[PDB]
């Protein structure tokens, strides 16, 4: 059931902002590893004396990487005279975030009809404000509320690129990489206590719960058309193997964003291209399932995937799960940086055609059991 | 003249250590951009709860990238019980370094006969101690003194890999990249005042001055066999164009390492390979000289380089300078990270055969004049 209870008009995921120590090196690594092109910048060369911010895009997916300059460059500025292009940025907040959590997501940004109204309604309904609505060049409004940990939910609304004060990137440094990634499917938080986290976020958004022994409990919040999807996990303590959610919270110094799931238009091509680059600057993937997992795929999805398509999943280490509505192909990277905290998921969904409805096939929760069983069977 | 006045036995450059916010992303970017292989690690997977450190190698060149974990992982440790593999590491020092200077070189490490003796003699002769000699697994001794700014000169000595507590990297993640870089030729500091910097460093090492209108004054300190080369620059103020040394000091928050010069066995292949990767995760190069510069090469080095070899320099943007002893091919990257501070030089030297003596052909100081003249001529 979908009660369509959003308290303001939400459109789509807009961008994800990483707070970094050095934005240049993270952005270049991510660009090569994920096949995202450099699309926009705001830095010293554009008159920004406060922060360096680089935008990568692939389809509709937008990854922003931001780091502070020396405060001495902007010491004479005040907020009314700032050269920052993102007015919510603060040197001390950014350094404190990074020192506490390491490399990770500061902002999950969604596009809304009216960022000022979304902010006001959110705070009226319990959201903890983080940055008030600020209108940029009479063209874009941006506002921020706390989501979980030190992650903010950022509202952006457009009267009619990316943000005022960003410049389009010179063609020569804009190499048109593309491994097939097209949009952000969902963004997932880890928290110590799921209940209070859900109540808080659903309280101020009106997002509804989307319909759904090893590590976690989780629930998913969704916008009216279920295209903005925000799962949240909590640990399940005193287990046989240690909870990966608890490990996250230990190494992250508390709650934060756990993973970003990136939809591909062709998950086979995306994984071929990403895996070719794992050991030359790109991303590594989690250890692949045993061959028993792929033999068991025939009985589970043999009506969705051909034998060749199942063998292609096996070559690439792709996992498969299935709803009553549709089927999910997914795979997980190793952690994106030094700490065993944030990672990326690549996904593609099949079914639920009307356009494809959001969350078709679920989130792969069946693959916890299915992986465990396949490895026990492979021990044989 | 070389008075061979080293106060202790110095062998060669050993490694360069970058202090990072996230060592993983910097190391992966550098590996792809420079063609260096992952050779060793010390991190959570090796029992290090303090710092993540990744070693890249190309020939004899060794680049170490280090970042701190959450102090909470090691809160119960004391120095006698530390799990750090580099005992001089300190969470607060590293975060303060990075917040102040951004991504850059913390340690210029040279191999010596006896790191404890080099440390004692250095401090007896005016060196400011930074980390005392510490013997690692009865096998390697490491000690540190201040060089300039927050950069340390690190002494390492071996009784008989890399460091105890580092593990050799699993083959699969060790892709054998190689664009031809073979060793560190020189490492260059920027300081506000050259005189006091020279007197200090030459005072405690016994390094001698190596024989040599636009931005700087500089001098070069050299070990007995002139294979350890440490140039130092100061700004020249009140100039037509602004001093690049002064710009460095402003954006770096004071003195620090300006550039690393990396010798290639085949600078043509290195630059072909690096330039292919500039816009897909690698490094960019400074704007190339005008064609007049390459026409002027015939009169300057036409007895060293063929016309084809001169045309190959032109295709790759390589600069050329010449001593009375030998000839230098060189080129400079754009800054390695967000700030206009540290960059890399790629070099190859021709002449001075006996092995090749250190510093053959100089450091390219003639290319300041030669670049200016060529651009004025190209304005035509
Ligand atoms: C996160 C995740 C999802 C997932 O998408 C999801 C939602 O979207 C919302 C509902 C709840 C949820 O879990 C689905 C399947 C899944 C994992 C998973 O996390 N794992 C471990 C794992 C550990 C450590 C690391 C790293 F080392 F990188 F930190 C990466 C993956 C292992 C594994 O076997 N299955 C099958
Ligand atoms: C550093 C340097 C050397 C050099 O090697 C050297 C020694 O080894 C010791 C003696 C003194 C010294 O200078 C040699 C030639 C040279 C430069 C040079 O720096 N430049 C500018 C330049 C600005 C900014 C940036 C960056 F934006 F990346 F910060 C990179 C290069 C411009 C240029 O035209 N010539 C010709
Ligand atoms: Co997921
Ligand atoms: Co140089």
Curated annotation (Swiss-Prot), chains A, B:
Catalytic activity: 3-(4-hydroxyphenyl)pyruvate + O2 = homogentisate + CO2
Keyword terms, alphabetized: Cytoplasm, Dioxygenase, Iron, Metal-binding, Oxidoreductase, Phenylalanine catabolism, Repeat, Tyrosine catabolism
EC code: 1.13.11.27
GO biological-process terms attached to the record: L-phenylalanine catabolic process; tyrosine catabolic process
Subunit structure: Homodimer.
Role according to the record: Catalyzes the conversion of 4-hydroxyphenylpyruvic acid to homogentisic acid, one of the steps in tyrosine catabolism.
Family: Belongs to the 4HPPD family.
Protein name: 4-hydroxyphenylpyruvate dioxygenase
Organism: Arabidopsis thaliana (Mouse-ear cress)
Gene, per the UniProt record: HPD
């Amino acid at each position: 059931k979908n009660p369509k209870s959003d308290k303001f008009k939400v459109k789509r995921f807009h961008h994800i902002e990483f707070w970094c120590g050095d934005a240049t090196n993270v952005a270049r690594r991510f660009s090569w590893g994920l096949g995202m092109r450099f699309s926009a910048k705001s830095d010293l060369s554009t008159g920004n004396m406060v922060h360096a911010s680089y935008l990568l895009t692939s389809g509709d997916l937008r990854f922003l990487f931001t780091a502070p300059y020396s405060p001495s460059l902007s010491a004479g500025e005040i907020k009314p005279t700032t050269t920052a292009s993102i007015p919510s940025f603060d040197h001390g907040s950014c350094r404190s975030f990074f020192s506490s959590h390491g490399l990770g997501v500061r902002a999950v940004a969604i596009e809304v009809e009216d960022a000022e109204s979304a902010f006001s309604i959110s705070v009226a309904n319990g959201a903890i404000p983080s940055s008030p609505p600020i209108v940029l060049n009479e063209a874009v409004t941006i506002a921020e509320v706390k989501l979980y940990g030190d992650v903010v939910l950022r509202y952006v609304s457009y009267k009619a690129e990316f943000l005022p004060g960003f410049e389009r990137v010179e063609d020569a440094s804009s190499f048109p990489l593309d491994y097939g990634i097209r949009r952000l499917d969902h963004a997932v938080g880890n928290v110590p206590e799921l209940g209070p986290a859900l109540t808080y976020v659903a309280g101020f958004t009106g997002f509804h719960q989307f319909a759904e022994e090893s590590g976690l409990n989780s629930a998913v919040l969704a916008s009216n058309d279920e295209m903005v999807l925000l799962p949240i996990n909590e640990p399940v303590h005193g287990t046989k193997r240690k909870s990966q959610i608890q490990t996250y919270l230990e190494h992250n110094e508390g709650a934060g964003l756990q993973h970003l799931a990136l939809m591909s238009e062709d998950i086979f091509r995306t994984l071929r291209e990403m895996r070719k680059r794992s050991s030359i600057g790109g991303f590594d993937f989690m250890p692949s399932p045993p061959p028993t997992y792929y033999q068991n795929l025939k009985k589970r999805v043999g009506d969705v995937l051909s034998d060749d398509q199942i063998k292609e999943c096996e070559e690439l280490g792709i996992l498969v799960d299935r709803d009553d509505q549709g089927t999910l192909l997914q795979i997980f990277t190793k952690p994106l940086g030094d700490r065993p905290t944030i990672f990326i998921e690549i996904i593609q969904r099949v079914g639920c055609m009307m356009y494809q409805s959001g969350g078709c096939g679920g989130f792969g929760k069946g693959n916890f059991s299915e992986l465990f069983k396949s490895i026990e069977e492979y021990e044989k």
